[PDB]
Symmetry: D2
Subunit: 120 residues, 4 copies
């Protein structure tokens, strides 16, 4: 029960988890370029688990990109955004469990992080 | 009015159409001497999603006020059956003298957010 | 694993669950008055479970009130809101699992409902 | 300017202090012919949390634009170490002719929301 990184996606129009949403994760590279890190599709409960492991999850800059436009086109709704992106630094600073959650509407989105830890 | 020095203004936006939320009914109450809510002001949002002229500086004394927005009538007229009955904002006002209050609401059928911007009147 | 109603509370300032937040639930009465239904305090994970049961959870109007002001005063932050309230109708219409989530900041809050169901 | 017919306006608010987010750096890019982001316009929010005058109707052609807000420099100057590096909004503009775009952001240290209000210019 150790997932250093988890993504959750919700739909504000229908009051349900946003199922089958593509998610891509990149790590900032030395040349200051984005390199593919992990990717997947949200499950029936709007979640994506097992993107990585504590050993591979070192300090650095990460970018989480959510394909919100494909989600909305499948419902027959025209969206405003091309995609939703979250960029943050992961620091061993202290606590290492990260939950990124995204709430989606056709013209707006909100994102929040919940950073927590078992013990230390 | 002036430019924007109203003691109380409400602004409602639509997260589904990316537009101002027009013709939304808004009701404001003040808590009375007896723990009961009394009618204070009423109105509807204009074509830019705003509601101006609800009160005056002199009438807007210190107190606990309730801003109730009728979101359910708004989604229903669009053919959508939403989650909430209404949106309500409860807050203590003019506590440490007069201030100008902007209450904003962003609406979606199963979600809403609300924010306040408080400014100190011509200092 | 059957909780018709669950409440989740998060803190936007500190990126953590909002722990020990008082929550009260009322049911609209015939005289159109609010009657105490259930109450509790959020756990270490920001959640409140077991407010009720499927038999007691009949159709009607419910009001969930979150004591946000006490939460913020304990951190030494002066808040704008007296409390956060969610009013909704529970209809057997179809699906009966309700998750109310609230995200808190000193001057703003957002609430969303996730309505779902196992089978039917 | 006029009253409010700017093709692109940005508005940043602070959810912790209930105020406009003043002196926030904003950078806008357009995707070029070669899948690369090119600099388009730059600026800072004023005392009301707004940014006016970034472009003109004639210069704002159809394309994919990126609005990047520097939220991290804003929280840091307040003594707070926030979660995000910045906030970014990516969207296709003027696709089916000219429109006026208002991008709003509401900020908190570990959260942000963004909304767009799109209007059809003097019809
Ligand atoms: C971006 C934004 N997000 C919210 O969650 C919210 C709420 N409530 C309001 C606004 C906002 C939009 C336009 N002008 C001012 C504030
Ligand atoms: C991202 C998010 N945004 C909101 O505006 C909100 C409200 N209210 C809740 C959540 C949320 C975060 C984590 N788990 C579930 C929901």
């Amino acid at each position: 029960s150790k997932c250093p990184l988890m993504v959750k996606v919700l739909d504000a129009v229908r009051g349900s988890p946003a199922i089958n949403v593509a998610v891509h994760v990149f790590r900032k590279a030395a040349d200051d370029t984005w390199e593919p890190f992990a990717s997947g599709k949200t499950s029936e409960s709007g979640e994506l688990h097992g993107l990585t492991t504590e050993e591979q999850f070192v300090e650095g800059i990460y970018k989480v990109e959510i394909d919100t436009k494909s989600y909305w086109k499948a419902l027959g709704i025209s969206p405003f955004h091309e995609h939703a992106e979250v960029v943050f630094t992961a620091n061993d600073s202290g606590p290492r469990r990260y939950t990124i959650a995204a709430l989606l509407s056709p013209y707006s989105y909100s994102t929040t992080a919940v950073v927590t830890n078992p013990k230390e």
